C-alpha cells in the first residue's frame, strides 16, 4: 500500500517522454508513489476511457497528462474522472506548442484542466503542483515540499557569472 | 430517408453556427440527423455515437465545437468514417483556439477541417455532399446545379 | 465555517469574471473568502496574504488577473499551497497577454492555469473542489452529483 | 482500369515533395491507385485550371493538394472541380506554416477545402481521409482501412522507454 | 476615358472597404472600372479578366478579398501588370488571414500588399496613382497637390 | 543616361543585404539600371530624408526598401517621396519577420507602401513588381519581362523527383 | 511654466488615448505641451520637433501612434532625450501592429514602450514623472503621494 | 561616492545573463556606475521586495530588469519602487520572447515599466535609455552620450558589401 500509486502520469506517445520525464523525476525526488504510462486519446480512446474512469477507485488522487499538437488527452481524461487533472502542453514542431497550449487550457466551464507551461518547465511544475495538492493531507510530504521550496530559494545566486 | 450524414455539436451555443450545415444538407435533400454531443460533458455519449455511426448507415460526420474543441478529433478516434470539423468562433480568441485544437491532428487520425464559423459549417455540408455525390448520381446532379447557380449568381459590379 | 479556499483578484474590474468562481464554491457549500489583492498596486498586501495563507487554514488559492497578470505567479512564489490562475479577458489582446503571463511559469513555482474568462473562473472553482474532495467525503459526493447533473442535463438535439 | 488513378496528389513545387511524399506512401500502402504531380497555382495557373476542370471526367474521386506560404493551390483547385478537395499546409520557413494554414482553411462558404495539419502529419492524414472517403463505396478498401486503423491502435505501447 | 486601373473585389461584402479605392481614383480623375470578381466562385471570370487586362489598356489592378484571399495572387498569376492587394478585414481573424494569404507570395509572382481594411484600399488607389504619375505629368501634378494638402491639413494640436 | 538609375534599393544595414541582394540580382537580370545603398531610418534619419526627398529629381522612378524588426525605413521613405515605394520585410531573429511585416504593411490611409513577402521571396518580388511598373512605359523591358514570366511558367516540372 | 514634457500623437484619432497622459501630467502639475505630429503625413514637422526638443528645454517626449506606428522610433532617431512610446489600439489588429512597430527597436536607438491603449498613455506620463522626480524634490514628493494614494485606495473586497 | 551605483541591472537567472550582459557593457562604456545582480521574482520574492523598496535610498536612479517566460521581475520591481523601471524581455525557447514581451509591457495604468525589444537589442537599449535619463542632470554624461550617438550615425556605411 506504501508503494501504491497516488499520481498517474500519462502521455500521448514516446515522443512526449522527453518532456514528461521531468514530472516523473520530480515525483520520485519527493518520494511520491506514481505510475507512468502511454495513453493516446486518438489512437487508444477506449484505453483512455477505462484509465480515467477507474483512476479514483484504483487509488489515484491526481492525474498529470501531457500531449502535443491537437492535444486532447488532458481534456478527455478530465471528462471521465472526478479527480483533478493537470495538463502539460508538449512543444510541437511547427507551432512551438501554441496549438498544444490552446487545445489544453481553453476548456469550457464545467470540465477543468489545470494547465502548466509549454515543455519541460510545465512537466516539472505539474509534478510540483500535484505534490502541493497531496501535501494538504500528507504531513510528511508537506515537510519535504517545504524543504524543497526553501532550498530552491536559498540556492539562487546573488550575481551572475560574467565569465 | 435514413440519415447518411450526422451533424453533431458540443452545445446549444454552437447551433447558431451549425444550423448553416443543417440548412445546406436540407437544401440538397440529403437525409441527416442533427444532434448535440459534448466531448467533455457527455464523453460516453460521444464514444457510443462514433463507434456505432457506420453500423447505423452514416457515411459522413460533421462535428462542430469551440474553445478546446475536441469533439471532431475524438469522434474520428472511434470511427472509420470521414469526419469533418467546424471550428466554432470563441468569445476571446475568435476561434483560433477552436481551429488549432481541431486541425492539428497528428498522423493516423484525420479530421478534414473547414473555416472558423458559419462559412465552415456551410462548407462542411458542401464537402459532405461532394463525398456522397461520388456514389449518388442524382445528388451529384443537384450539387452540380448548386455550384453552377453559385457561380452564375455572382454580380459583375457592386451596388 | 472557516474559509478553505481564497479567491483573490487584481481589481473590481475582474469581479465580473471571478464572480463565477465565487458562485460555484457557494453552490458546492465550500467555505471561502473573496478579496481584491493587486500584485502591482498592493504588493505588500499580496506578500502578506500569500505568506500567511497556509497558517490561516486555506487549502487552495484561486487568483484572477488581466493584462500583465502577475497575481497568480507571485502568490505562488510566497505560498506552498496550490495556486490556480484565471486569465481575465483584456480589452485589446482578449486575454492572450493574461494567459501567457500566467501559464508560462518556469519550473519550480507552479500555477495551475484555466481558460480565459468566465469559463476559467468556473473551472478554477471546480478544480479547487476536486482537490478538496480528496479528503472530504461529503464534498466528494456533492461534486459527483454536480458532475453527474452536468452530464445528464446536456440536451440530445438543438432547439 | 484497375490501375486508373482515383486520387490525385498535386503540389506547388519540388520543395513540397518532402511533405507530400507521406500522402503518396500511405495511398500506396492501402493499395489506392493515384497520380502525383506538380501544379503551381501561381506559375502554372492554366495547368491548374485544366487539371481541376477535367479531374472528374478523368476518373478522379478525390484531390489532395499541398502548398506553402500564400497557399492558393487547394482553394483554386476546389473552385474548378466538384470533387472533394483536401488541403495540406506545407510548413513555411518564417511563419512555420501559419500562413499556409490560414490561406487554405479559411475558405468562405460555397467552396470547401477539407484541411489537415501543417506538415507531414497533414499529408499522411489527407491520404487517410481520402481512403475513408473511398472506403464508403469500396468494400475491399474498407476492410484494409479497418485493419490499418486496428493495427495502429494495437501497436501503441503501454509505457514509455525510460532509456 | 478608357479605364487605366481596374478595381476588382471578391464580393459585395468587400465593397464597404473597396469603395475607398474607388473614391480616391475618382478624386484624382483617374479613369477606372470597378467590378466584382470572385477567385473561388468565378474562377474563369478571373482568368479571363487578368489575361486580357493589358490588351484592354489597363495599367494597374487593385484587388481586394478577405479570409483565404486568393484574388490578388491569382490575378497576378495571369497578368504581367502590377497587381496591388487589399486584405479585407474578416469577421473572426480581423484580416490576419486575409493579410497572410495575400502578402506571402513566393518569389516569381508579386502582389504589392497594402494595410488591412479601408486604409489599404485608399493606399492601393494612391499607390496606383503614383505609378501612373510616372508617365502622366498632369496626374503627377494633381498627386503632388493631394499629398501637399494632406500634409498641410494635419492640425498642430488635438481638439 | 542609359546607365542612370531608375530604381533605388535601400536597406537599413549590412545584415539586410543577404535578403536584399535578391532584388539587386533580379533588376540586373532584367537589365534595369539601379543603385543599391544602406540607409538607416534610425541611425541616419537625415540621410533618409534627403534620399527620399530628392529621389524623383534624381531620376528614380521606384524605391525598394528593406528593413527588419521595428521596420520604419519603407514607411518614412514614402512619407518624403511621391514615388511608389515597395517594402520588403526582413526576417527577424525572434519574431521571424512578423514585427517587420506589420511595421511595414500597416500604413494608414494617405501614405502607401506596397509590401511583399517576408524574406528573399519578398526581395525578388519587389524587383519584379518594380519591373512591371517600369514595363508600362518601356516596351523593351516589357518584352524582357514577358519572356521572363513565360520562361518561369514553362520551366515548372510536371512531376516531383521521388529520389 | 515652460514645458518639460512633450506629448505628441499621430492624429486626432489618437487623442482619446493620449488624453490620459495629458490628464496625469496636469494632475501632478508637470508643465507640458500636447501636440499632433504625424511621422507619415508631417515628416519634416517631426524632424524639426525632435531635433529641437532638447534646446527648447524638454526633458522627456511621450509619443503615441497606431498601426505601422513610427512616430516614437523616428522621434528617438533625432533626439538624445528619453522617448516613451504608447501603442494606440488599432481597429483590426487591436494594437499588436502598434506594439511591435514601437517596441522592437534595434540596439542603438531606444524607445521605452508602455502598454497598448489608455493604460499605456497613463503609464507613459507616470514614467515621465518618475524620471523628472530624480532631480525635482517637490515633484518627487507629489509622485510619492500619488503612488501612496493609489495603493491605499484599492478596496479589500469586490462590490 | 564616485563609484556608487546609480543604475541597477537585475535579472531572473544566470540564463538571462547572455542577454543582460549587453546592458552591463553599454553602461560601462558610457562610464555609468552600476550594480549587476540576480533577483528572481518567483524564487526570491522577498529579495526582490527588499531590493526594490530600498533602491532609492541606496542611491539608485534607474532599474533595468530582465526576465523571460512569465516575466514578472520588471513589473513587481516597479510595484515597490518609485524609480523608473525599464524592462527587457528575454527570448524564450518556445514562444521566442512573445510571452516575455506581453508579460512585461502590458502593465495596467498606475505602475509603469518602460519596455525595450526582445533580446540583446532590448538590453543594449535599456542601458541607452537609462543613460539618456541620467544625462538630463549630468552634463558630463550628456556629452559622452551625444558623442556616442553622433559616432553611431557617422559609422553607418553608404553601401553594402556585396562580397
Which of H94, H97, H99, H103 is best to mutate for the A interface (most A CBs within 10 A)? H94
| CA distance linking residue H117 with residue H91, whole number of Å | 10
- In this structure, the number of other CB atoms found within 10 A of the CB of residue B1 comes to 3
| CA distance linking residue A43 with residue B108, whole number of Å | 8
Reference A41, options C96, E38, D156, E71; nearest CA is D156
Tell me if E88 sits within 8 A of E66, measured CB to CB: yes
Tell me the helices (H) and strands (E) count for chain G, helix number first.
6, 5
- What angle do the packed helices H73-80 and H98-105 form, to 10 degrees? 10
- In chain D, which residue's Cα lies nearest the Cα of E73? D42
Reference D69, options E102, E30, E119, H160; nearest CA is E102
DSSP H stretches of helix in G2-115: 15-27, 43-52, 71-78, 96-103
Reference G55, options G18, G10, G7, G6; nearest CA is G6
- In this structure, the number of other CB atoms found within 10 A of the CB of residue G48 comes to 13
Mark yes or no for CB contact G82/H118 under 8 Å: no
| Residues of chain G contacting residue H124, judged by C-beta atoms under 8 Å apart | 107-108
| Residues of chain D contacting residue B143, judged by C-beta atoms under 8 Å apart | 82
- In chain C, which residue's Cα lies nearest the Cα of A118? C104
| CA distance linking residue C126 with residue C24, whole number of Å | 7
DSSP C28: T
- In chain E, which residue's Cα lies nearest the Cα of B159? E12
- In chain F, which residue's Cα lies nearest the Cα of D17? F160
| CA distance linking residue A78 with residue C115, whole number of Å | 14
Using CB atoms, pick whichever of D82, D111, D145 lies closest to residue B80: D145
Q: Is E43 helix (H, G, I), strand (E, B) or coil?
A: helix
Q: Where does residue B103 rank: exposed (0-12), middle (13-18), buried (19+ CB within 10 A)?
A: buried
Q: Which chains touch D (3 or more CB pairs under 8 A)?
A: A, B, E, F
The arrangement of strands across the sheet holding G112-113 comes to G32-36, G5-9, G60-66, G83-88, G112-113, H114-115, H85-90, H62-68, H7-11, H34-38
| CA distance linking residue E52 with residue G101, whole number of Å | 40
Phi, psi angle pair for F83, to nearest 5°: -75, 155
G with H: how many residue pairs have Cβ under 8 Å apart? Answer: 116
Q: Is E56 helix (H, G, I), strand (E, B) or coil?
A: coil
Q: Is A160 helix (H, G, I), strand (E, B) or coil?
A: coil
Mark yes or no for CB contact F70/G100 under 8 Å: yes
Q: Judge whether E97 is annotated as a binding position.
A: no
Residues placed in the known binding site of F for substrate: 13, 16, 43
- In chain E, which residue's Cα lies nearest the Cα of B88? E92
What Å distances lie between residue H49 and C47, C75, C94, F151, G153, CA to CA?
9, 13, 30, 68, 21
Write the CB contacts of G86 (distance below 8 Å, at least 6 apart in sequence): G17, G18, G21, G62, G63, G64, G65, G72, G102, G113, G114, G120, G121, G124
| Residues of chain D contacting residue A47, judged by C-beta atoms under 8 Å apart | 156
Class of domain B1-159 as given by CATH: alpha beta
Write the CB contacts of B114 (distance below 8 Å, at least 6 apart in sequence): B84, B85, B86, B87, B120, B121, B123, B124, B127, D105, D107, D112, D113, D114, D115
Residues placed in the known binding site of D for substrate: 13, 16, 43
What Å distances lie between residue A81 and A47, B24, C119, C131, CA to CA?
14, 38, 19, 12
Reference C9, options C53, C30, C49, C39; nearest CA is C39
| CA distance linking residue F146 with residue F143, whole number of Å | 5
- H163 to chain G nearest CA, in Å? 24
Tell me if F136 sits within 8 A of F22, measured CB to CB: no
List the domain boundaries for chain D: 1-163
Indicate left, alpha or beta for F157 from its phi (over 0: left) and psi (-120 to 50: alpha): beta
- In this structure, the number of other CB atoms found within 10 A of the CB of residue A5 comes to 17
Tell me if F80 sits within 8 A of F47, measured CB to CB: no
* Distance, CA of F27 to chain centre: 10
Fold of A1-163: Rossmann fold (3.40.50)
Reference G34, options G75, G55, G3; nearest CA is G3
| CA distance linking residue A39 with residue A11, whole number of Å | 6
Mark yes or no for CB contact A161/H21 under 8 Å: no
Determine which helix (DSSP H) or strand (DSSP E) holds C36, and give its type and residue range.
strand C32-36
CB burial of G57-91 (b: ≥16 within 10 Å; e: otherwise) equals: ebbbbbbbbbbbbbbbbbbbbbbbbbbbbbbbbbb
Tell me if B4 sits within 8 A of C123, measured CB to CB: no
Which of A41, A42, A44 is best to mutate for the B interface (most B CBs within 10 A)? A42
Mark yes or no for CB contact H146/G122 under 8 Å: no
Using CB atoms, pick whichever of D96, D157, D160 lies closest to residue A95: D96
Using CB atoms, pick whichever of A70, A78, A113 lies closest to residue B105: A70
Residues facing G121 on adjacent strands: none
Phi, psi angle pair for A90, to nearest 5°: -85, 135
Chain B residues in contact with chain E using a Cβ-Cβ cutoff of 8 Å? 89, 94-96, 115-117, 119, 150-151, 154-159
Q: Is B66 helix (H, G, I), strand (E, B) or coil?
A: strand
Write the CB contacts of E110 (distance below 8 Å, at least 6 apart in sequence): E76, E82, E83, F116, F125, F126, F128, F129, F132
| CA distance linking residue A90 with residue A122, whole number of Å | 9
Determine which helix (DSSP H) or strand (DSSP E) holds A130, and give its type and residue range.
helix A120-134
Q: What is the DSSP string of A18-60?
A: HHHHHHHHHHHHTT--EEEEE--TTT-HHHHHHHHHHTTTTT-
Q: Where are the beta strands (DSSP E) in chain E?
A: 5-9, 32-36, 60-66, 83-88, 112-113
Tell me if A19 sits within 8 A of A123, measured CB to CB: yes
Measure the N-to-C terminal CA separation of chain E; round to a whole number of Å.
Answer: 42
Tell me if E121 sits within 8 A of E86, measured CB to CB: yes
| Residues of chain B contacting residue A111, judged by C-beta atoms under 8 Å apart | 40-41
Q: Is the dihedral of CA E50, E51, E53, E54 positive or negative?
A: positive
Using CB atoms, pick whichever of G99, G104, G118 lies closest to residue H109: G118
Residues facing E20 on adjacent strands: none
Residues facing C86 on adjacent strands: C64
DSSP E36: E
Which of E86, E92, E93 is best to mutate for the B interface (most B CBs within 10 A)? E92
Q: Judge whether B97 is annotated as a binding position.
A: no
Tell me if E142 sits within 8 A of E128, measured CB to CB: no
Cα angle at D13 between D7 and D17, to 5 degrees?
65
Tell me if D77 sits within 8 A of D10, measured CB to CB: yes
Q: Considering just the CA atoms, what is the radius of gyration of chain F in Å?
A: 16
Tell me if G113 sits within 8 A of G64, measured CB to CB: no
| CA distance linking residue G100 with residue E96, whole number of Å | 15
Mark yes or no for CB contact H86/G112 under 8 Å: yes
The experimental technique behind this entry is X-ray
| CA distance linking residue G32 with residue G62, whole number of Å | 10
A with H: how many residue pairs have Cβ under 8 Å apart? Answer: 46
Q: Is E1 helix (H, G, I), strand (E, B) or coil?
A: coil
DSSP H107: P
DSSP H stretches of helix in chain F: 17-29, 45-54, 73-80, 98-105, 120-134, 139-154
DSSP B45: H
Tell me if B60 sits within 8 A of B76, measured CB to CB: no
Pairing relationship of beta strands F85-90 and F62-68 according to DSSP bridges: parallel
DSSP H stretches of helix in B9-136: 15-27, 43-52, 71-78, 96-103, 118-132
- Give Dmax (Cα) for chain H: 55
Q: Where are the beta strands (DSSP E) in chain D?
A: 7-11, 34-38, 62-68, 85-90, 114-115
Mark yes or no for CB contact E80/F145 under 8 Å: yes
| CA distance linking residue F88 with residue F23, whole number of Å | 10
| Residues of chain F contacting residue H158, judged by C-beta atoms under 8 Å apart | 37-38
Q: Is F63 helix (H, G, I), strand (E, B) or coil?
A: strand
What Å distances lie between residue B94 and B66, E91, G97, CA to CA?
9, 9, 18
Write the CB contacts of D141 (distance below 8 Å, at least 6 apart in sequence): D30, D31, D32, D131, D134, D135
| CA distance linking residue B137 with residue H103, whole number of Å | 58
| CA distance linking residue D119 with residue D18, whole number of Å | 9
List % helix, strand, coil for chain C (3-state, nearest 5): 50, 15, 35
| CA distance linking residue C140 with residue C154, whole number of Å | 22
DSSP H stretches of helix in chain C: 15-27, 43-52, 71-78, 96-103, 118-132, 137-153
Q: Which chains touch B (3 or more CB pairs under 8 A)?
A: A, C, D, E
| C-alpha neighbours within 13 Å on the C-beta side of residue E103 | 37
Amino acid at each position: 500500500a506504501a508503494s501504491a500509486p497516488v499520481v498517474g502520469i500519462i502521455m500521448g506517445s514516446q515522443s512526449d517522454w522527453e518532456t514528461m520525464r521531468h514530472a516523473d523525476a520530480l515525483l520520485t525526488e519527493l518520494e511520491i508513489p506514481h505510475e507512468t504510462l502511454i495513453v493516446s486519446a486518438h489512437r487508444t480512446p477506449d484505453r483512455l476511457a477505462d484509465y480515467a474512469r477507474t483512476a479514483a477507485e484504483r487509488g489515484l488522487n491526481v492525474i498529470i497528462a501531457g500531449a502535443g499538437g491537437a492535444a486532447h488527452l488532458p481534456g478527455m481524461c478530465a471528462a471521465w474522472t472526478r479527480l483533478p487533472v493537470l495538463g502539460v502542453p508538449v512543444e510541437s514542431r511547427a507551432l512551438k506548442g501554441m496549438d498544444s497550449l490552446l487545445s489544453i487550457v481553453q476548456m469550457p466551464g464545467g470540465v477543468p484542466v489545470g494547465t502548466l507551461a509549454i515543455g519541460a518547465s510545465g512537466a516539472k511544475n505539474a509534478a510540483l503542483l500535484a505534490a502541493s495538492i497531496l501535501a494538504l493531507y500528507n504531513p510528511a510530504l508537506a515537510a519535504r515540499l517545504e524543504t524543497w521550496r526553501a532550498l530552491q530559494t536559498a540556492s539562487v545566486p546573488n550575481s551572475p557569472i560574467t565569465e
